[PDB]
Symmetry: none
Subunit: 434 residues, 3 copies
């Protein structure tokens, strides 16, 4: 029914005064019941992970009590399903399994990865006291859960020597964006507190700021990635590889981006981009520009960062710097708005932009052009607020179609829920004569 | 003026309670203008290669923008010169040619080899995309440049069937220590990502270590040589031979050290030691001891590793293990401090040690005795830091003299530069 | 009790659509205690040599410390026994002598040959320092050991004028497949480093490969047989003849296969095939097809190579070429899977195939018929891995029976051991019509 996306190029154009552009479809169709949702107003649905494979999809959501940020994790719900045509305007969702993560009080975070008729959930867990109660902010290895239709969920505990991390981590969170399967391996992104014993010079690219001549901005940038304390350690990003996945003896390996090449660690996502791979790192700190990397073989050295700035993250931030110059300061950003590449070098890509208006959010769907042009359509005008977006695209009915998963509140007094929509990406050869 | 080093042995001694030792000279003479240097504070001079032949020397340096490690290569500069006496306390350097490597943005790395009135630069190059811009960490064959006084630099491209390597390599770097010429052949060291599909047991020699599981050390040692990436590959060291150098159609051949017999791949150097040959491999991973091999015909099987531990590499490392026990862990070392052998079995050799003090370095020059005695003299105290050293020795004024080429910063806020100094090795019969 | 094999031909068929084929027996019976085996997990049993004569057999095994490839040779153990019927499903082994080769630390390799109530071990030895310690990778003549029931072993040192080799060899290894006795002579295969002063054109037969134009593949092939070093010399194969073996003054003669007629030198085996003879050469380099030769008088020149490709060696190799085309490359193969001929022309023969599966091996026993049909039966499914096979057949209970000697690990964490099994060869006249 669906196929992995075929990055399409102009069969025609190749003409004087013609531009090959891409743009979002006119409509934003609902994809109902991608996953289950309670109507209980005391419950917050948050931190989704969404990945689409050959034909199946993997989706996960945390159900927390009261507070979306710090409320107790009441449940972590996983859905394996399939993208199918139920005769609607756009593609639809058919859940095949719904499953709950055991002992959710010990989970730091989970994320999903969709492959071929098989799906994965990777979770990091914190240390447990003798009481069984979680000792928060800590790290006690991983759980890997393998999902497959009509097969019991398979559990793997990765602990001890099943993991080897290039730095020593006091806390570990799997990036909610998700990961990918490549052959007999999985790839995720994770971030956390790594112990650090060496001096650093954190990545500190910014615009026109006052007092730049003094090293004061570099001191800000360096402080941004550190920890407050007697023991100062770094909030850092890293790749996780899950080796020997079919063997039944999975091993997890890490390599960490040095502060010289990253901003504060944050929720991330791993992408398969043709023969190459990609990484998205949401803003968590003062730099709110798009942080997206391209890599041929999934290493820190081969990761190159896109120079385009869109989407600029404007919600869920205590920062006060300008979108023009993005001057460094100590502040916190905790949103998520990733992209989906539409070409092999990802010079074309689709995303969702969110701008705050009157303690609500106004949202648009957009496709970025190789020139830098952004084709945008306002979306969800009836919705009160949308705070996050993850997008996964594919071939459906011989066109590129994307599903976007967004946290938000339909009405102001609702508890936060998670909503799924679909749209298509259209290609044109307009002849534009000024 | 200079001759290849004559490992000189006790002329007298041979008496009870008499021991033949060697030691460094009391003074540390400068060797100015071995190669040119810019004052541009935005340029880092890094990764030198220094080799001394019959009478000429070869020197090469990368000039990079801003960052000494990962900054863009603005230039790769080669100097062919002669070691001569200009009436100073010690020997001096006379540049004969200065030349730049074309398209340095495509180079992975280069190294030099000094012969008899002729010198060589071997460079590995990465793939160039359709844009002409380099693709990082990839491989597209080699360039060989032959240098000779009053002769145009002769270039040789070595791609496709002109290079045949015993493993399939995705990335290749020539070891910055340099190489040697033997007859019609050259020998260099190289390292890189080689694809591997067979299970391994990496070389994993250490001291007393008590990991809670205890089985961790072999698994650690196994990871250290493996690569994080899409494809299972090993970071591996290997010998390069350049055949048929006179033909004008040079061919490059490889053989790789298995993980069982090596640590993580790293910058290396090939040595001529009388009738035999030697290899230095800088530490790149948890094992920071001296890794030096001896071989009669330059093969992996005939390579025997010296048991002495000095110099221990203590700078440019994220490792936290002890110099006593060297327990394996996942960490990176990126220094280079080779030795120069002073006897046939390389039981006598000179080296430079660097110890970190308050984010500056304290440095000494030293000579090893066959008993294990170490004769050391502090050097460059006024320099803020020295981070690397390559040493090449020779006969000069009827004595053994060594030149050491060192990366470092004269004062803390300077950009890194490359400095050359000389010293002599004196022979004594202590009682 | 047993007789040398009587290659058996169709007494019937000669009918339309009737085909005379041969096939393996349904069962794979154990042959326990063919030779002794330790329980010490520090010891690897490797490089077996197995030969069956008139009624006795000769068997040898290297016992090395830790590493099967390069571990120190702790022992070289020889067993002379008889194939007998102990009332089992299959034939069984009665060890008659067990003996250790003196000073195993000096041995390069040994191999065996079983005759008529007499067996032989031929060993090549390296040079010794004055310390008594071996100088590896070097050559210092031979030892020949004569074994006979109820008789002490006889030793023959063969040095200096007692060996005449056609090339100057710096290292010499006897092919572990073994040799034969013909009259008053023995015949083995050996390989090693021979000095080379003349240009060469190494055998370079392969399939469809890209870049073939302009040769250059010939350059690979030429390189593949050479040695890396200060001294380049050739890794070459050769026949050994041991003359006047009853004299008590044995002399060893060598004829070397030129590179033009050989791939990289490797462990080999000599066969008696009716009135003619045969040679097996395990793949050691890029060509992994069956290398088997037929010769009427054991000369390099009279050797003809079989055109069949099976068994293809798929284990113990760093090569990455395809089984379809076998493109040359610089790589190493260190397996051993020989055949046993079942007819005078070796158009019928039995073998064992090994295919790698998930860091284990899957194995089958097979018989190839003159038309090209292969009858295969999976064997040793409970075994973790099997990496090598030598097969010798014979008459037993008026049928052809074969014994197969295989290196492998019964379970994954075991040290490598050597295992012996038996099976029979059955003849059929199938009738199939299009």
């Amino acid at each position: 029914t669906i196929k992995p996306v075929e990055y399409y190029k102009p069969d025609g154009c190749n003409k004087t005064n013609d531009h090959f552009t891409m743009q979002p479809g006119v409509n934003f169709y609902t994809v109902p019941n991608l996953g289950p949702s309670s109507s209980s107003a005391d419950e917050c649905y948050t931190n989704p992970s969404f990945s689409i494979g050959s034909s199946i999809y993997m989706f996960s959501q945390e159900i927390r009590k009261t507070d979306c940020t710090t409320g107790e994790i009441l449940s972590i719900q996983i859905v394996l399903g399939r993208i199918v045509d139920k005769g609607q305007q756009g593609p639809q969702a058919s859940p095949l399994l719904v499953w709950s993560v055991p002992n959710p009080k010990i989970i730091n975070s989970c994320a999903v990865a969709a492959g071929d008729e098989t799906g994965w959930v990777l979770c990091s867990v914190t240390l447990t006291a003798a009481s069984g109660e979680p000792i928060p902010h800590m790290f006690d290895g991983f759980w890997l859960y393998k999902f497959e239709p009509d097969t019991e969920v398979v559990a793997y505990r990765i602990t001890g020597f099943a993991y080897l991390l290039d730095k020593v981590y006091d806390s570990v969170f799997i990036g909610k964006g998700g990961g990918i399967q490549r052959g007999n391996d999985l790839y995720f992104q994770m971030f956390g507190l790594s112990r650090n014993r060496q001096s650093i010079k954190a990545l500190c690219e910014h615009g026109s700021c006052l007092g730049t001549g003094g090293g004061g901005y570099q001191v800000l940038c360096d402080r941004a990635v550190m920890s407050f304390g007697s023991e100062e350690s770094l909030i850092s990003n890293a790749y996780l590889k899950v080796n020997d996945v079919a063997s039944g003896k999975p091993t997890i390996i890490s390599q960490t981006f040095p502060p010289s090449d990253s901003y504060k660690g944050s929720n991330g996502r791993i992408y398969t981009i043709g023969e190459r791979y990609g990484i998205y790192l949401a803003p968590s700190s003062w730099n709110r520009y798009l942080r997206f990397g391209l890599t041929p073989d999934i290493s820190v050295r081969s990761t190159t960062w896109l120079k385009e700035k869109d989407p600029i993250m404007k919600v869920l931030t205590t920062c006060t710097n300008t979108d023009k110059d993005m001057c460094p300061e100590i502040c916190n950003t905790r949103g998520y708005q990733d992209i989906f590449p539409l070409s092999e070098d990802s010079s074309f890509y689709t995303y969702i932009g969110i701008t705050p208006s009157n303690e609500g959010t106004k949202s648009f769907v957009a496709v970025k052009d190789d020139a830098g042009h952004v084709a945008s359509i306002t979306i969800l005008p009836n919705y009160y607020s949308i705070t996050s977006a993850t997008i996964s695209c594919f071939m459906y009915k011989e066109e590129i179609w994307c599903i976007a998963v967004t946290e938000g509140r339909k009405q102001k007094e609702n508890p936060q829920r998670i909503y799924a929509h679909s749209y298509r990406v259209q290609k044109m050869c307009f002849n534009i004569k000024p």
